[PDB]
Amino acid sequence: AKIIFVVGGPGSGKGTQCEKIVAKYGYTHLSSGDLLRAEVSSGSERGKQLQAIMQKGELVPLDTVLDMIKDAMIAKADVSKGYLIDGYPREVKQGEEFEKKIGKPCLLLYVDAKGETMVKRLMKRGETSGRADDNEETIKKRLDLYYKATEPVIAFYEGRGIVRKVDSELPVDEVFKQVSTAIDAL
Numbered sequence: 651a652k653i654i655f656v657v658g659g660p661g662s663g664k665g666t667q668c669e670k671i672v673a674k675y676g677y678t679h680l681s682s683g684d685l686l687r688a689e690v691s692s693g694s695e696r697g698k699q700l701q702a703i704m705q706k707g708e709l710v711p712l713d714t715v716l717d718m719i720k721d722a723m724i725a726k727a728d729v730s731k732g733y734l735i736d737g738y739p740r741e742v743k744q745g746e747e748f749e750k751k752i753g754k755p756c757l758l759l760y761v762d763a764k765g766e767t768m769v770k771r772l773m774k775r776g777e778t779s780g781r782a783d784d785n786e787e788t789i790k791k792r793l794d795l796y797y798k799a800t801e802p803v804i805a806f807y808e809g810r811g812i813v814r815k816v817d818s819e820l821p822v823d824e825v826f827k828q829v830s831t832a833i834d835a836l
Protein backbone atom coordinates (compact mmCIF):
# COMPACT_ATOMS: atom_id res chain seq x y z
CA ALA A 651 0.00 0.00 0.00
CA LYS A 652 1.11 3.57 -0.71
CA ILE A 653 2.60 5.53 2.20
CA ILE A 654 2.37 9.30 2.14
CA PHE A 655 4.06 11.45 4.79
CA VAL A 656 2.31 14.71 5.57
CA VAL A 657 4.67 17.17 7.24
CA GLY A 658 4.36 20.83 8.21
CA GLY A 659 4.40 23.17 11.17
CA PRO A 660 1.87 23.31 14.02
CA GLY A 661 -1.40 24.64 12.59
CA SER A 662 -0.06 24.63 9.03
CA GLY A 663 -3.15 22.70 7.99
CA LYS A 664 -1.96 19.07 7.80
CA GLY A 665 -5.08 17.54 9.35
CA THR A 666 -7.44 19.68 7.31
CA GLN A 667 -5.83 18.59 4.04
CA CYS A 668 -5.65 14.97 5.18
CA GLU A 669 -9.41 14.80 5.76
CA LYS A 670 -9.99 16.13 2.24
CA ILE A 671 -7.59 13.49 0.86
CA VAL A 672 -9.58 10.82 2.69
CA ALA A 673 -12.91 12.03 1.30
CA LYS A 674 -11.66 12.19 -2.28
CA TYR A 675 -9.11 9.38 -2.53
CA GLY A 676 -10.08 6.98 0.25
CA TYR A 677 -6.65 6.82 1.89
CA THR A 678 -6.34 5.92 5.56
CA HIS A 679 -5.56 8.98 7.71
CA LEU A 680 -3.31 8.23 10.68
CA SER A 681 -2.50 11.18 12.92
CA SER A 682 0.31 10.75 15.44
CA GLY A 683 -1.27 13.49 17.56
CA ASP A 684 -4.68 11.79 17.54
CA LEU A 685 -3.14 8.44 18.49
CA LEU A 686 -1.21 10.02 21.37
CA ARG A 687 -4.28 11.93 22.59
CA ALA A 688 -6.25 8.66 22.50
CA GLU A 689 -3.70 7.18 24.87
CA VAL A 690 -4.02 10.25 27.09
CA SER A 691 -7.81 9.76 27.16
CA SER A 692 -7.43 6.15 28.28
CA GLY A 693 -6.39 7.28 31.76
CA SER A 694 -3.29 5.08 31.61
CA GLU A 695 -0.05 5.98 33.40
CA ARG A 696 1.60 6.23 30.00
CA GLY A 697 -1.19 8.63 29.04
CA LYS A 698 -0.34 10.83 32.02
CA GLN A 699 3.30 10.95 30.91
CA LEU A 700 2.30 11.78 27.32
CA GLN A 701 -0.09 14.51 28.47
CA ALA A 702 2.71 16.22 30.44
CA ILE A 703 5.04 16.18 27.43
CA MET A 704 2.41 17.35 24.92
CA GLN A 705 1.17 20.14 27.17
CA LYS A 706 4.73 21.53 27.19
CA GLY A 707 4.88 21.41 23.39
CA GLU A 708 7.73 18.88 23.41
CA LEU A 709 8.32 15.80 21.25
CA VAL A 710 7.14 12.43 22.52
CA PRO A 711 9.86 9.71 22.37
CA LEU A 712 10.25 8.00 19.00
CA ASP A 713 9.63 4.54 20.47
CA THR A 714 6.15 5.39 21.72
CA VAL A 715 4.90 7.34 18.72
CA LEU A 716 6.28 4.88 16.14
CA ASP A 717 4.72 1.97 18.08
CA MET A 718 1.31 3.63 17.86
CA ILE A 719 1.65 4.44 14.18
CA LYS A 720 2.64 0.86 13.38
CA ASP A 721 -0.20 -0.44 15.62
CA ALA A 722 -2.70 1.69 13.71
CA MET A 723 -1.35 0.73 10.27
CA ILE A 724 -1.59 -2.95 11.13
CA ALA A 725 -5.15 -2.51 12.45
CA LYS A 726 -6.20 -0.91 9.14
CA ALA A 727 -4.11 -3.18 6.91
CA ASP A 728 -7.02 -5.25 5.62
CA VAL A 729 -8.87 -2.23 4.24
CA SER A 730 -6.24 0.39 3.32
CA LYS A 731 -5.22 1.13 -0.26
CA GLY A 732 -2.89 3.78 1.10
CA TYR A 733 -1.86 5.58 4.28
CA LEU A 734 -1.57 9.25 5.16
CA ILE A 735 0.91 9.59 7.99
CA ASP A 736 0.06 12.97 9.46
CA GLY A 737 2.52 14.55 11.91
CA TYR A 738 5.15 11.81 11.66
CA PRO A 739 8.12 12.00 11.04
CA ARG A 740 9.06 15.08 13.07
CA GLU A 741 12.77 14.35 13.21
CA VAL A 742 15.17 12.61 10.81
CA LYS A 743 15.59 9.61 13.10
CA GLN A 744 11.81 9.09 13.06
CA GLY A 745 11.83 8.82 9.28
CA GLU A 746 14.79 6.44 9.39
CA GLU A 747 13.23 4.15 12.01
CA PHE A 748 9.90 4.10 10.16
CA GLU A 749 11.69 2.95 6.99
CA LYS A 750 13.56 0.35 9.02
CA LYS A 751 10.45 -1.04 10.73
CA ILE A 752 7.64 -0.44 8.24
CA GLY A 753 8.66 0.77 4.79
CA LYS A 754 9.51 3.74 2.56
CA PRO A 755 7.15 6.63 1.76
CA CYS A 756 6.30 7.26 -1.90
CA LEU A 757 5.56 10.96 -1.32
CA LEU A 758 6.03 13.64 1.31
CA LEU A 759 3.43 16.40 1.22
CA TYR A 760 5.10 19.44 2.69
CA VAL A 761 2.31 21.64 4.01
CA ASP A 762 4.03 25.00 3.99
CA ALA A 763 2.72 27.91 6.07
CA LYS A 764 4.28 31.07 7.47
CA GLY A 765 5.25 31.13 11.14
CA GLU A 766 2.97 34.06 11.88
CA THR A 767 0.09 32.33 10.09
CA MET A 768 0.54 29.26 12.28
CA VAL A 769 0.58 31.32 15.49
CA LYS A 770 -2.65 33.05 14.41
CA ARG A 771 -4.43 29.83 13.46
CA LEU A 772 -3.49 28.08 16.70
CA MET A 773 -4.37 31.07 18.85
CA LYS A 774 -7.80 31.15 17.19
CA ARG A 775 -8.33 27.42 17.60
CA GLY A 776 -7.22 27.67 21.22
CA GLU A 777 -9.77 30.39 21.94
CA THR A 778 -12.40 28.25 20.19
CA SER A 779 -11.79 24.58 20.98
CA GLY A 780 -9.52 25.03 24.00
CA ARG A 781 -6.99 22.28 23.23
CA ALA A 782 -4.47 22.27 26.09
CA ASP A 783 -1.33 22.95 24.03
CA ASP A 784 -2.99 25.75 22.03
CA ASN A 785 -1.85 28.40 24.49
CA GLU A 786 0.53 31.16 23.44
CA GLU A 787 3.61 29.97 25.32
CA THR A 788 3.22 26.36 24.18
CA ILE A 789 2.49 27.41 20.58
CA LYS A 790 5.80 29.28 20.51
CA LYS A 791 7.64 26.21 21.80
CA ARG A 792 5.91 23.96 19.24
CA LEU A 793 6.84 26.28 16.38
CA ASP A 794 10.45 26.63 17.52
CA LEU A 795 10.72 22.85 17.83
CA TYR A 796 9.29 22.48 14.34
CA TYR A 797 11.96 24.75 12.87
CA LYS A 798 14.79 23.00 14.72
CA ALA A 799 13.85 19.32 14.52
CA THR A 800 11.37 18.89 11.69
CA GLU A 801 12.63 21.06 8.85
CA PRO A 802 15.65 18.74 8.46
CA VAL A 803 13.04 16.02 7.71
CA ILE A 804 12.02 18.02 4.66
CA ALA A 805 15.68 18.20 3.58
CA PHE A 806 16.10 14.45 4.07
CA TYR A 807 13.17 13.67 1.79
CA GLU A 808 14.27 16.34 -0.69
CA GLY A 809 17.43 14.25 -0.93
CA ARG A 810 15.25 11.19 -1.43
CA GLY A 811 13.43 13.12 -4.16
CA ILE A 812 9.83 12.77 -2.97
CA VAL A 813 8.86 16.14 -1.47
CA ARG A 814 6.00 18.10 -3.03
CA LYS A 815 5.35 21.45 -1.40
CA VAL A 816 1.86 22.90 -1.15
CA ASP A 817 1.19 26.54 -0.23
CA SER A 818 -0.97 26.38 2.87
CA GLU A 819 -1.30 30.19 2.93
CA LEU A 820 -3.97 29.73 0.25
CA PRO A 821 -7.65 29.06 1.00
CA VAL A 822 -8.23 25.45 2.05
CA ASP A 823 -9.77 24.36 -1.27
CA GLU A 824 -6.95 26.04 -3.22
CA VAL A 825 -4.35 24.21 -1.13
CA PHE A 826 -6.24 21.00 -1.86
CA LYS A 827 -5.99 21.63 -5.60
CA GLN A 828 -2.21 21.57 -5.15
CA VAL A 829 -2.49 18.48 -2.94
CA SER A 830 -4.67 16.77 -5.54
CA THR A 831 -2.20 17.57 -8.30
CA ALA A 832 0.61 15.82 -6.39
CA ILE A 833 -1.48 12.75 -5.59
CA ASP A 834 -2.85 12.47 -9.14
CA ALA A 835 0.71 12.49 -10.50
CA LEU A 836 1.64 9.44 -8.42
Ligand SMILES: Nc1ncnc2c1ncn2[C@@H]1O[C@H](COP(=O)(O)OP(=O)(O)OP(=O)(O)OP(=O)(O)OP(=O)(O)OC[C@H]2O[C@@H](n3cnc4c(N)ncnc43)[C@H](O)[C@@H]2O)[C@@H](O)[C@H]1O
Binds near residue numbers: 659
Ligand atom coordinates in the same frame (compact mmCIF):
# COMPACT_ATOMS: atom_id res chain seq x y z
N1 LIG B 1 5.78 12.36 15.35
C1 LIG B 1 5.72 12.90 16.65
N2 LIG B 1 6.84 12.75 17.36
C2 LIG B 1 6.92 13.23 18.63
N3 LIG B 1 5.85 13.87 19.19
C3 LIG B 1 4.71 14.03 18.47
C4 LIG B 1 4.62 13.55 17.21
N4 LIG B 1 3.37 13.85 16.74
C5 LIG B 1 2.71 14.52 17.71
N5 LIG B 1 3.54 14.62 18.79
C6 LIG B 1 3.19 15.30 20.01
O1 LIG B 1 1.66 15.69 19.89
C7 LIG B 1 1.61 17.01 19.89
C8 LIG B 1 0.51 17.46 18.92
O2 LIG B 1 0.80 16.87 17.66
P1 LIG B 1 -0.27 17.16 16.49
O3 LIG B 1 -1.67 16.68 16.90
O4 LIG B 1 0.20 16.54 15.18
O5 LIG B 1 -0.37 18.75 16.49
P2 LIG B 1 0.28 19.72 15.46
O6 LIG B 1 1.52 19.18 14.82
O7 LIG B 1 0.60 21.00 16.20
O8 LIG B 1 -0.80 19.85 14.34
P3 LIG B 1 -2.20 20.55 14.55
O9 LIG B 1 -3.31 19.53 14.56
O10 LIG B 1 -2.16 21.42 15.79
O11 LIG B 1 -2.36 21.44 13.28
P4 LIG B 1 -2.50 21.00 11.76
O12 LIG B 1 -1.18 21.25 11.02
O13 LIG B 1 -3.01 19.59 11.53
O14 LIG B 1 -3.54 22.04 11.17
P5 LIG B 1 -5.13 21.92 11.14
O15 LIG B 1 -5.54 21.20 9.88
O16 LIG B 1 -5.70 21.32 12.42
O17 LIG B 1 -5.54 23.45 11.04
C9 LIG B 1 -5.14 24.34 12.03
C10 LIG B 1 -6.17 25.51 12.13
O18 LIG B 1 -6.09 26.28 11.09
C11 LIG B 1 -7.37 26.05 10.16
N6 LIG B 1 -6.85 25.89 8.82
C12 LIG B 1 -6.27 24.83 8.23
N7 LIG B 1 -5.93 25.16 6.97
C13 LIG B 1 -6.29 26.45 6.79
C14 LIG B 1 -6.16 27.29 5.68
N8 LIG B 1 -5.61 27.07 4.35
N9 LIG B 1 -6.61 28.56 5.73
C15 LIG B 1 -7.18 29.02 6.90
N10 LIG B 1 -7.31 28.21 7.98
C16 LIG B 1 -6.85 26.91 7.92
C17 LIG B 1 -7.94 24.98 10.60
O19 LIG B 1 -9.41 25.02 10.41
C18 LIG B 1 -7.59 24.98 12.10
O20 LIG B 1 -8.39 25.85 12.80
C19 LIG B 1 2.97 17.46 19.38
O21 LIG B 1 3.21 18.79 19.69
C20 LIG B 1 3.83 16.44 20.14
O22 LIG B 1 3.88 16.86 21.56
